[PDB]
Motif scaffolding. Structure first.
Motif, PDB file in Angstrom:
ATOM      1  N   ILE A 413     -32.203  -8.988 -57.857  1.00 41.25           N
ATOM      2  CA  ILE A 413     -32.499  -8.353 -56.568  1.00 41.25           C
ATOM      3  C   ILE A 413     -31.826  -9.071 -55.401  1.00 41.25           C
ATOM      4  O   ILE A 413     -31.249  -8.438 -54.518  1.00 41.25           O
ATOM      5  N   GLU A 414     -31.892 -10.401 -55.392  1.00 45.15           N
ATOM      6  CA  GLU A 414     -31.275 -11.169 -54.310  1.00 45.15           C
ATOM      7  C   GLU A 414     -29.789 -10.859 -54.156  1.00 45.15           C
ATOM      8  O   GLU A 414     -29.271 -10.851 -53.045  1.00 45.15           O
ATOM      9  N   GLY A 415     -29.098 -10.597 -55.266  1.00 48.42           N
ATOM     10  CA  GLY A 415     -27.669 -10.311 -55.191  1.00 48.42           C
ATOM     11  C   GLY A 415     -27.218  -8.897 -54.844  1.00 48.42           C
ATOM     12  O   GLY A 415     -26.035  -8.671 -54.549  1.00 48.42           O
ATOM     13  N   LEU A 416     -28.146  -7.946 -54.859  1.00 51.10           N
ATOM     14  CA  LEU A 416     -27.822  -6.548 -54.565  1.00 51.10           C
ATOM     15  C   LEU A 416     -27.208  -6.254 -53.209  1.00 51.10           C
ATOM     16  O   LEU A 416     -27.602  -6.813 -52.189  1.00 51.10           O
ATOM     17  N   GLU A 417     -26.230  -5.359 -53.210  1.00 51.29           N
ATOM     18  CA  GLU A 417     -25.591  -4.918 -51.982  1.00 51.29           C
ATOM     19  C   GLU A 417     -25.552  -3.387 -52.023  1.00 51.29           C
ATOM     20  O   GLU A 417     -25.672  -2.781 -53.083  1.00 51.29           O
ATOM     21  N   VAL A 418     -25.408  -2.757 -50.872  1.00 54.42           N
ATOM     22  CA  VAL A 418     -25.382  -1.313 -50.849  1.00 54.42           C
ATOM     23  C   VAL A 418     -24.095  -0.788 -50.235  1.00 54.42           C
ATOM     24  O   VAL A 418     -23.637  -1.285 -49.204  1.00 54.42           O
ATOM     25  N   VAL A 419     -23.503   0.203 -50.895  1.00 56.71           N
ATOM     26  CA  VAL A 419     -22.264   0.816 -50.426  1.00 56.71           C
ATOM     27  C   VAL A 419     -22.515   1.487 -49.082  1.00 56.71           C
ATOM     28  O   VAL A 419     -23.398   2.334 -48.968  1.00 56.71           O
ATOM     29  N   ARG A 420     -21.743   1.120 -48.067  1.00 57.13           N
ATOM     30  CA  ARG A 420     -21.907   1.739 -46.767  1.00 57.13           C
ATOM     31  C   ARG A 420     -20.741   2.677 -46.464  1.00 57.13           C
ATOM     32  O   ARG A 420     -20.947   3.810 -46.036  1.00 57.13           O
TER      33      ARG A 420
END
Ligand SMILES: [Zn+2]
Length: 454
Positions: A413-420
């Motif tokens: 979870i800490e490493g998750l990023e979201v495509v913007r």
């Protein structure tokens, strides 16, 4: 394959490096590059050269060391459309249409999707913590502190019969406590201590001992082009101790909350930013318009990242004033509102295995762990939850179970990023790629680190 400007961290004989993909190719070109006529690509066999990168293991869901066997160089033209992917964090990844990424689905499943299948809002698996232990080394801290508040120059005695030129190191700080710690170290390490001088609100020590000045000159050699190689090559423990010294010297804790480290040395700031991201700390760089120039400021504002920053660097700070402020802004965090699209029922199933009880209060979701009540925002009703809230709950769940599976979920979870943003282009682009044995993916990127698949 990805753009040559992407940064990547790799190691040899325990010796780490941080360079762009281009430079990595150029660095081993001498071993001889072969042309793959069928696939119109240039390669370099490094299977015999121990080269390791950070790889993600979808199976165990943890970060492992991946063996590189071949470094590829491609020339992609207008016959193929390139996909530029930018995350919420600012992380940039320019790649090919078929290049797949690790995506976390709402049901907490990891799947591979090619760049042309991605869409805004998708959750990408990015740089994450490894949970391992780290050791603080004062010698490297002092090197980082000197990098920020130290000054090297030449001292000419000019005394008759003693006309020699010595290297002189002066270290400055607004607190006298800093120098009492340094003297204690210098006395036991070099059998030398210095009277603490004062010059109008500022304290400092004047060092002319040849063994101490040369020791630190050699450690900081190359600081102009990034993290000094002598430090970097020594790995995590040395680099992290070094950053802590750097933060003690010029770091700033704000009430946003967050931490900032600004310097005019662009290359050093860039390197530190990429190094932190590779360890799971989501840092980014921002440019601050100054008087005679521009200051490059590293920023960390994500709650989960600040907490991680505290555990790896913050607790080792020598300036007790900055350390305490950081602990206070941390224990008092309102909440990052950006919600991750994750399904609550899927999480519920998983968490039940641990005896976690769930309750609701209208649209609000509550988790009960060891009699304690933890708010999960409006998760069960929106199927959206903020990284901060979820990270807080998982740290509690881990503290109550000490189970590695929980710890693994936390790091994921800490490493998750979201495509913007997702854009295209057909411009002249030379891409590179790495064939990683077994895992088939490595950690790299611009202004961030993300796991790219072969
Ligand atoms: Zn002179």
């Amino acid at each position: 394959c990805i753009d040559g400007k992407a940064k990547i961290i790799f190691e040899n004989e325990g010796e780490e490096h941080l360079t762009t993909m281009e430079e990595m190719y150029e660095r081993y070109k001498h071993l001889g590059e072969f042309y793959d006529e069928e696939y119109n690509r240039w390669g370099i066999d490094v299977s015999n050269v121990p080269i390791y990168v950070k790889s993600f293991d979808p199976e165990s869901k943890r970060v492992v060391k991946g063996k590189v066997n071949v470094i590829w160089k491609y020339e992609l033209g207008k016959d193929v459309t390139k996909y530029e992917i930018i995350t919420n964090k600012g992380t940039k990844i320019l790649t090919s249409p078929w290049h797949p990424f690790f995506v976390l689905t709402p049901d907490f499943k990891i799947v591979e999707k090619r760049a042309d299948e991605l869409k805004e809002g998708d959750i990408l698996i990015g740089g994450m913590p490894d949970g391992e232990d780290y050791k603080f080394i004062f010698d490297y801290w002092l090197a980082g502190f000197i990098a920020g508040d130290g000054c090297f120059d030449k001292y000419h005695s000019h005394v008759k019969g003693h006309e020699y030129i010595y290297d002189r190191l002066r270290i400055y700080d607004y607190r006298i406590e800093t120098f009492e710690i340094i003297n204690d170290y210098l006395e036991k390490t070099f059998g030398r201590k210095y009277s603490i001088q004062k010059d109008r609100n500022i304290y400092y020590i004047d060092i002319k001992a040849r063994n101490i000045t040369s020791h630190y000159l050699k450690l900081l050699e190359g600081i102009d082009n990034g993290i000094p190689p002598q430090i970097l090559k020594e790995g995590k423990n040395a680099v992290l101790s070094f950053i802590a010294g750097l933060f003690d010297a010029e770091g700033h804790v704000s009430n946003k909350p967050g931490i900032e480290l600004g310097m005019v040395n662009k290359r050093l700031i860039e390197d530190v930013t990429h190094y932190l991201n590779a360890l799971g700390i989501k840092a980014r760089i921002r440019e601050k318009l100054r008087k005679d120039g521009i200051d490059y400021v590293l920023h960390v504002e994500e709650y989960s990242s600040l907490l991680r920053f505290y555990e790896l660097i913050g607790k080792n700070l020598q300036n007790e004033e900055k350390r305490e402020k950081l602990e206070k802004v941390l224990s008092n965090h309102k909440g990052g509102n950006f919600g991750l699209p994750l399904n609550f029922n899927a999480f519920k199933e998983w968490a039940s295995e641990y005896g976690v009880e769930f309750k609701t209060n209208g649209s609000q979701t509550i988790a009960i762990i060891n009699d304690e009540r933890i708010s999960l925002g409006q998760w069960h009703t929106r199927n959206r939850v903020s990284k901060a809230v979820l990270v807080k709950m998982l740290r509690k769940l881990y503290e109550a179970t000490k189970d590695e599976e929980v710890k693994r979920m936390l790091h994921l979870i800490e490493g998750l990023e979201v495509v913007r943003h997702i854009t295209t282009t057909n411009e002249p682009r030379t891409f590179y790629d790495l064939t990683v044995e077994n895992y088939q993916n490595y950690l790299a990127g611009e202004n961030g680190m993300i796991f790219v698949h072969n």
